[PDB]
């Protein structure tokens, strides 16, 4: 039984994949103590990606899907079924690991009985930004969701204890193109207690290179996960978590500024209708735990009032 | 017939009452010319308050209520029934009078045929602040409600002509825990003409120590009713002006003025705004033009009973 | 057939009219090539205005209306029926023409086959300001409505080809006291292609519940969306959106929502504004300047509070 399975889905990556794979194979951890599982989501780049992967035959486990799934959910789920390790680490195909990522994160995790270990993120290039606040207090052995800003770092680019995933049958959902990674991390967080944060190096480097029916279905699942948490059983604690997630959603959500956008009016109405329907399944008791700058925007969404959301956005 | 009855309700004050009572007994006014009526609202402090009051038996009139009323309304009403003086002065149990408060206020009142005399307030300690604007023009023999900011000083901690109270049967109401003193002063102001302001000393020292609105807005409703039924201010346009100015004071200093963006439960906000809307919609819109224009949107939002609009209005103030 | 008929309605102008009439009679154009038609809207100023007009008997055509119409619509319509010229030029009674206004504008128009020629405006005194942006690019032989800011200069104080007015039976409407001149210019613009702008001089000097108003605004949008010149629906949306922008920037009672207007009047006004704008396709909204995105939606939603707020944020 290996310490870590690195699970990496690929799709039409080409010669860029060399850098990523190399970063995983060049770890300070004993090479026999981890594996790299590569799951190609049926690349169609005239065999360029598959040719790069073939160069590491013998040194990595590999499966190719018959049809392209469209996102990383099915590939990652396939990797999870293939792993029998203590921890898994999800890695995106364009990104890089620091030489001492698996060793340092696994050691910290093992020494603190961690269900989840989060390594400090770095970033190369303009594009997506990475979480910063979670890492501002240095290393944290027993982190807290609220006090350590974990709802602002819900990517799956972390080390997860496989037993938690297995015991609770946590899979990536495929009903949406976005926020499926958030739902996964939330499901995990709500079914575990021990989270640790390690910040000695930039362990993971992120490399930068419609009506909302499906999106808000996923957001709904996130709130459901919080309110059904067997770890956070206290209803007031659930309200606090839900409120904090609402804050993150209003700060960093998809199409956060839809109301004053160039979007067609009928589309705005349908979008807000889905956002309203979803947030109105969340107890109002959570609202008091939302950052108060968003008090008006949140009420506007609850009331399903487009004008009020437009105004709220103008005042933010 | 005495010049002044000082009416002071007490409740679980203890040894703090000595300072207050002493301030009343040590007045420059002839001691035979006034009385201190003490009405204890059934203190339950192991007889501590009653023990302090007993030390002045013979120098004060005193009645104890059988059950605690909860506020100062019933006690003050009892004091009024007991007084046969020319003027009454309401004093709170923790507060102080200046040595020359009754004398100076009574003299100014008598020399100007005043129905109401307001002495400049002082304050000791962090907490509740006191009115300032009303006293910024010095002494005023014939003051005006609007021009002298009297709607921003509606406490009953003043000298009132008893005849006005008696002739018009003015009592403190008990349907609400708050704003009952405001309603009293408003009822008095709307049934009298002569108000004087005296500022030579800090005559009254306020001492600081270290709801769905059904009843509150019923009291606010009574305030508007008092203005619009005033036999002194009979001109409808004058009533609009007074009403508008009160609306301004309510939006500036009202209870839970910032309820809309508060941590109040949504259902409570709705009920609160519903009461606020129901009440303000009984006030003619003709008064709105006399409201300070910064509040134009907030006022309309309340009239329309639109929570979102009130929230926004508050964000723009 | 004369080159130009200057059409000038008068009403209780008095001795101020001398200056105006003099400015028309003192043109560089051959005096036999134009006429000044004066239409008095039944002045009642103890014969003062009529006395000034009588001094130019022989030099002007003149008709007096039996009853005062209240605005310039009926008078101007009367002038149009009286003119058989190639172009007409509407002149207000207190205003002035530059010595070389008719000549320069007619020549430019004739040389560019212009349906409409717009001379640069000047202004004397505090009050109404005049369009500026339309004239910022100098002379334009073939102007464009959008690119040359013509919706910000919709007065009829311009030179119009009479054939376009007769062929399309364009009259000033009388349903409203205001915006009737705008409707006229819009009707003209939507039924012609060739517009020219001349800026060498200040050729024209301006001297200083909404049921009816919004009926007129409605006619403006109708004119755009029925235009036989601008037939492309997307072009109509663009024109409509640009007019909406001008309406929000310079409309009558633009700031009604936070005004001293009685509440009941505000509601009725906004109701008319909402009813009218909701007959305009939402496809035009994308062509409205985005600062007005909220105000426009507020009006569409007929929400007084939202209009008040919108105005507070502008
Ligand atoms: O006191 P509050 O909680 O109201 O305010 C919090 C502070 O203001 C705090 O300083 C900041 O929120 C912390 O922000 P940050 O500088 O640490 O960055 C965190 C951001 O959330 C981060 O840059 C991303 O927006 C979050 O991305 P991930 O959670 O890692 O997941 C990617 C996610 O966006 C992706 O799944 C979506 O594109 C698809 O739905
Ligand atoms: O906008 P305008 O020009 O019309 O007026 C605004 C001016 O700036 C105005 O002159 C100032 O507001 C006057 O303020 P101030 O400095 O004279 O006094 C401040 C307050 O009036 C005062 O501190 C209290 O807030 C008022 O309470 P009271 O009138 O003494 O009545 C007691 C009442 O609040 C009590 O019943 C409540 O606690 C129960 O709800
Ligand atoms: O926001 P965009 O990009 O679409 O353009 C905005 C620019 O800033 C634009 O240049 C300005 O809005 C307009 O420039 P301007 O300095 O030439 O503005 C001229 C005004 O439109 C003018 O002072 C009058 O408002 C319009 O005169 P007319 O419409 O020709 O007169 C008849 C009618 O408007 C009049 O009855 C109304 O003013 C009565 O309220
Ligand atoms: C840098 C970061 O925060 N990454 C997130 C970001 O990825 P990002 O926006 O960077 O997009 P990426 O190219 O990294 O794609 C994510 C991963 O999914 C794989 N892939 C992509 C397309 C496809 O059809 N099939 C497939 O398996 C890619 O090989 C890659 O490993 O948004 C994704 C979708 O919301 C998240 O799940 C990622 O964790
Ligand atoms: C500085 C100032 O503006 N003071 C006001 C403030 O008093 P404040 O907030 O200072 O409250 P206080 O304790 O002074 O109460 C007012 C008076 O009521 C008496 N009391 C209190 C409780 C009780 O159950 N029974 C009873 O009789 C107290 O003895 C006291 O003399 O709010 C009161 C209630 O609106 C007003 O009447 C006071 O004018
Ligand atoms: C500079 C400018 O754009 N002015 C416009 C403004 O006039 P403005 O506000 O400048 O008012 P004016 O004095 O120019 O009056 C407009 C003209 O209408 C005539 N008149 C006036 C009253 C009357 O009862 N009968 C009558 O015929 C006047 O003689 C005058 O020639 O509003 C009119 C109606 O929307 C427009 O046609 C004018 O172009
Ligand atoms: Cl999101
Ligand atoms: Cl007054
Ligand atoms: Cl109050
Ligand atoms: Cl207009
Ligand atoms: Mg990536
Ligand atoms: Mg007190
Ligand atoms: Mg609203
Ligand atoms: Mg004029």
């Amino acid at each position: 039984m290996k310490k870590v399975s690195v699970i990496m889905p690929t799709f039409n990556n080409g010669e860029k994949l060399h850098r990523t794979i190399s970063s995983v194979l060049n770890q300070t951890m004993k090479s026999t103590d981890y594996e790299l599982i590569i799951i190609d989501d049926h690349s169609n780049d005239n065999g360029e990606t598959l040719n790069v992967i073939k160069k590491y035959k013998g040194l990595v486990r590999f499966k190719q899907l018959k049809k392209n799934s469209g996102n990383a959910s099915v590939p990652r789920n396939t990797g999870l079924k293939m792993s029998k390790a203590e921890y898994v680490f999800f890695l995106d195909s364009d990104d890089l690991l620091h030489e001492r990522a698996l060793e340092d994160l696994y050691n910290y995790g093992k020494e603190n009985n961690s269900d989840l270990i989060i390594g400090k993120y770095g970033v190369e290039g303009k594009g997506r930004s990475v979480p910063k606040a979670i890492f501002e207090k240095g290393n944290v052995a027993k982190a807290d969701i609220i006090d350590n800003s974990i709802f602002y770092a819900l990517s799956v680019l972390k080390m997860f204890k496989k037993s938690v995933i297995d015991k609770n049958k946590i899979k990536f959902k495929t009903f949406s193109k976005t926020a499926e990674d958030q739902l996964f991390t939330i499901e995990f967080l709500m079914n575990s207690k021990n989270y640790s944060i390690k910040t000695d190096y930039e362990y993971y480097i992120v490399v930068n290179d419609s009506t909302g029916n499906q999106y808000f279905a996923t957001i709904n699942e996130i709130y459901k996960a919080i309110y059904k948490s067997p770890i956070y059983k206290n209803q007031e604690k659930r309200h606090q978590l839900a409120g904090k997630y609402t804050t993150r959603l209003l700060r960093h959500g998809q199409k956060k500024n839809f109301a004053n956008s160039k979007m067609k009016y009928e589309d705005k109405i349908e979008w807000l209708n889905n956002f309203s329907k979803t947030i109105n399944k969340v107890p109002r008791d959570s609202d008091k735990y939302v950052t108060q700058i968003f008090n008006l925007k949140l009420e506007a969404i609850r009331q399903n009032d487009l004008l009020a959301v437009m105004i709220a956005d103008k005042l933010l």
Side-chain angles (χ1 to χ4, degrees), chain A residues 278-299:
Chain A
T278 291
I279 220 79
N280 279 331
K281 295 169 188 163
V282 179
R284 281 184 163 273
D285 306 60
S286 63
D287 290 0
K288 75 181 94 87
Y289 297 107
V290 179
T291 299
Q292 282 306 286
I293 55 164
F294 298 112
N295 79 308
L296 169 61
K297 180 144 185 214
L298 177 55
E299 193 53 55

Side-chain angles (χ1 to χ4, degrees), chain A residues 80 86 113 115 161 163-168 170 187-188 191-192 230:
Chain A
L80 277 173
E86 199 178 350
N113 195 34
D115 301 312
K161 200 176 226 153
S163 63
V164 177
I165 291 162
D166 288 347
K167 280 167 198 183
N168 299 279
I170 307 177
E187 259 157 6
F188 192 92
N191 287 278
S192 56

